[PDB]
Structure 1
Amino acid sequence: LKQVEIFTDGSCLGNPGPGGYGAILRYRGREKTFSAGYTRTTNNRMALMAAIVALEALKEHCEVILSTDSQYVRQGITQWIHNWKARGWKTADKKPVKNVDLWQRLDAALGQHQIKWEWVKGAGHPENERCNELARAAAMNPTLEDTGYQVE
């Protein structure tokens, strides 16, 4: 029943390089912000983190409208994540899946709520733009290591 709105964005100075994520959780006008910067990561991983952090902050089952502009997240959600799960998370050749640590973590957070995904594109909402600013700000002041990132 509880309805919330989530906005997310990932940002990276390189590929790989210093990056950050920015997310906003809005409930009844009220707002909650999330951001963190990593010394060496990818925009894809940051895009996943933004959604993961905002979703895991929820303390009850909620109806969520999650807005993101990541094409990487879109494909996983609407296409890959399904096949992966039903195959112990394997690729075309029974191999491990890239960023499984985040995809599994995100997959879990999704099963916790009824998510309605809005795949935008700066639908450039002011919120997504603000998340980008939070992400970029974090990328410019990294404080953590992205241990889950497999170089290259």
Structure 2
Amino acid sequence: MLKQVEIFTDGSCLGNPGPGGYGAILRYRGREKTFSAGYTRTTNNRMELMAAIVALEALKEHCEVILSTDSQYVRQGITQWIHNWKKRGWKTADKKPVKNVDLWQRLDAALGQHQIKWEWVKGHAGHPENERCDELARAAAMNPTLEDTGYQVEV
């Protein structure tokens, strides 16, 4: 049997683009570990991906992971887009590079490490760990210390 683990994720961004941060909680046997960092210019959706990437990459063995997020962007990519990407070489139908391909490829690499069950929640109301992830992400966005070196500025 695989170790069973729970991960909760959220991103936060003060603009589009603007300062942003991610927040994640990894829970195993009651014990909780938190992850967060802040970036000077980024987007909310890139921070949503970073939260999942960082928490999954922390795992040192193959796990069964219950992954909970309210991000409709992450949900659309996981359930609607990534199957096209893997057939098309990570390009659009116009043979153009897909947006945020650097983070989507990193997330896909981390996801392939584990047995993943996704828990798509509707919001933060009633989900205390997801609310705490939002607090972690917002706190980092208010004290950014890194550059989002993979963000291709759109403006």
Which TM-score tier does this pair reach, normalised by the shorter chain? over 0.9
Q: Secondary structure at the match of 1:86?
A: helix
* Distance (Å, rounded) in 2 between the aligned partners of 1:28 and 1:113: 18
Q: Deviations over 1:98-142 (max 9, x none)?
A: 111100000011111011001112274100000000000000000
Using a 3 Å threshold, how does the CA distance of structure 1 residues 42 and 79 change in structure 2: closer, same or farther? same
1:83 deviation in Å? 0.9
Q: Tell me the TM-score normalised to structure 1 length.
A: 0.98
Q: Deviations over 1:36-75 (max 9, x none)?
A: 0000000000000000000000011100110001110001
5+ residue gaps, structure 2: none
Q: Secondary structure at the match of 2:46?
A: helix
* Distance (Å, rounded) in 1 between the aligned partners of 2:61 and 2:8: 19
Q: Runs of at least 4 residues of structure 1 off by over 3 A?
A: none
Q: Tell me the TM-score normalised to structure 2 length.
A: 0.96
* Distance (Å, rounded) in 2 between the aligned partners of 1:12 and 1:3: 31
1:87 deviation in Å? 1.3
* Distance (Å, rounded) in 1 between the aligned partners of 2:138 and 2:19: 9
The percent identity for this pair of structures is 98
Using a 3 Å threshold, how does the CA distance of structure 1 residues 124 and 15 change in structure 2: closer, same or farther? farther
1:92 deviation in Å? 1.8
5+ residue gaps, structure 1: none
* Distance (Å, rounded) in 1 between the aligned partners of 2:86 and 2:68: 24
1:88 deviation in Å? 1.1
* Distance (Å, rounded) in 2 between the aligned partners of 1:79 and 1:107: 14
Q: Deviations over 1:8-38 (max 9, x none)?
A: 0000000110000000000000111000000
Q: Which moved further from structure 2: 114-123 or 17-26? A: 114-123
* Distance (Å, rounded) in 2 between the aligned partners of 1:78 and 1:121: 16
* Distance (Å, rounded) in 1 between the aligned partners of 2:136 and 2:33: 13
- Total equivalences in the alignment: 152
Counterpart in 2 of 1:56?
A: 57
* Distance (Å, rounded) in 1 between the aligned partners of 2:142 and 2:53: 21
